Amino acid sequence: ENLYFQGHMISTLNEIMKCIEDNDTIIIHRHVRPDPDAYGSQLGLKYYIQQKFPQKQVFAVGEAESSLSFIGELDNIDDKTYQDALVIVCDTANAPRIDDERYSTGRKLIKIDHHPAVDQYGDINLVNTNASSTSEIIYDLISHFNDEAIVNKDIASVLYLGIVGDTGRFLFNNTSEHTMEIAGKLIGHDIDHNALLNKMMEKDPKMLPFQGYVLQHFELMDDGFCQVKITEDVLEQFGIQPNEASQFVNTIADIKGLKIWVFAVDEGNEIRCRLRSKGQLIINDIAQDFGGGGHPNASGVSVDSWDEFEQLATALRTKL
């Protein structure tokens, strides 16, 4: 938290708003396979700009996810809308993982994210790994410009869901005192947080038999390591898609004596692995060692065979 980082944060914040002020059309993108924080940061920024600058044309684009559609509706726009437009990307550490490839077809590109800065693809890169979520960064932006009063029910609701998504509702280690203070203020806007959380947690009945496979086929070792391996034949047995299977990475997290676990889904020509750890244990390092990365307690790796998975395992078990 050096004094220089802080000064650069203020300047970056100020620069972003000038880019917003100087642009009539603002288009906001997020990552493929969106989560609540993706939807909440994108839409929250959209609604914030729309409230502060009611003449500007602000759009939120990408492929909609039916599980998240309750958060808000996305915009379908023409390729011409991008001409001399400001493009902002939320929540996306790597440019290949952005959901619409037109993010580069504009005059300016801004990145706002809370993942370690490894791909500085913006002309402006706002990165704060000390934030719980990109949603929380968006509220920090609002607070910087003393606009906390323009926050209405819509902004507060989508930003609240985004913080909740990335903290597991204030559970994970990325929840700070600042995180709780923001979420308190958001609830202050009468958003009926219980109703929102109930909607977000509601389950598609057709996915539950697969979740039961996880509960019955997890492998916990006395070491504190656990593994769940989903083969291509399993996804076929249950009629589910690999992104759908990935949403069950934390199904086993409450097991007594759990320390490190990996959730591996063979997506065909690539096994997507979600690496998770308890406490101050570190897995982000082993993730980078295999071409992956993310948070030290929540990172992702892809391998190309089950023999290479076993190496991801062995390496992870050395960390105790």
- Kindly list the residues in this chain that would bind its own copies in the complex (CB under 8 A): 169-173, 175-181, 183-185, 187-188, 192-195, 197-198, 201-205, 208-209, 211-216, 218, 220, 252, 254-257, 278-279
**What does DSSP assign to residue 119?**
-
What is the spatial distance between Cα 32 and Cα 28, in angstroms, rounded to a whole number? 13
Residue 113 sits in the site that holds Mg ion (CB under 5 A): no
**123 assigned to a ligand binding site:** no
**What does DSSP assign to residue 24?**
S
Residue 166 binding result from Mg ion, its own copies, none, given CB thresholds of 5 to 8 Å by partner type: Mg ion
185-224: contacts with Mg ion (CB under 5 A): none
Backbone angles phi, psi at 300, to 5 degrees: -125, 145
Tell me how far, at minimum, the Cβ of 277 lies from its own copies, in Å.
11
Residue 58 sits in the site that holds Mg ion (CB under 5 A): no
**114 assigned to a ligand binding site:** no
User: Which of 172, 169, 142 has the alpha carbon at shortest distance from 44?
Assistant: 142
Residue 120 binding result from its own copies, Mg ion, none, given CB thresholds of 5 to 8 Å by partner type: none
Look at the alpha carbons of 243, 244, 245, 246 in this order and tell me if their dihedral is positive or negative: positive
**119 assigned to a ligand binding site:** no
State which residue, 86 or 163, has the beta carbon closest to its own copies. 163
Kindly tell me which residue out of 13, 29, 37, 174 binds Mg ion, with binding defined by CB under 5 A: 37
What is the spatial distance between Cα 68 and Cα 90, in angstroms, rounded to a whole number? 16
Give the N- to C-terminal CA distance of the chain in Å, as an integer.
Answer: 30
User: Which of 16, 1, 298 has the alpha carbon at shortest distance from 130?
Assistant: 1
Residue 37 binding result from Mg ion, its own copies, none, given CB thresholds of 5 to 8 Å by partner type: Mg ion
C-alpha to C-alpha distances, 254 to 257, 259, 260, nearest whole angstrom: 9, 10, 12
Residue 176 binding result from Mg ion, its own copies, none, given CB thresholds of 5 to 8 Å by partner type: its own copies
Residue 208 binding result from its own copies, Mg ion, none, given CB thresholds of 5 to 8 Å by partner type: its own copies
Answer for the pair 271, 265: CB distance below 8 angstroms, yes or no: yes
Q: How many residues bind Mg ion (CB under 5 A)?
A: 6
Tell me how far, at minimum, the Cβ of 272 lies from its own copies, in Å.
22
Strand 57-60, strand 25-29: pairing: parallel
**24 assigned to a ligand binding site:** no
Other Cβ atoms less than 10 A from the Cβ of 138: the count is 30
- Region binding Mg ion by CB under 5 A among candidate stretches 18-26, 131-139, 142-150, 209-217: 131-139
**Residues found near Mg ion in the complex (CB under 5 A):** 35, 37-38, 91, 134, 166
Q: Which residues are annotated as a binding site for Mg(2+)?
A: 31, 35, 37, 91, 166
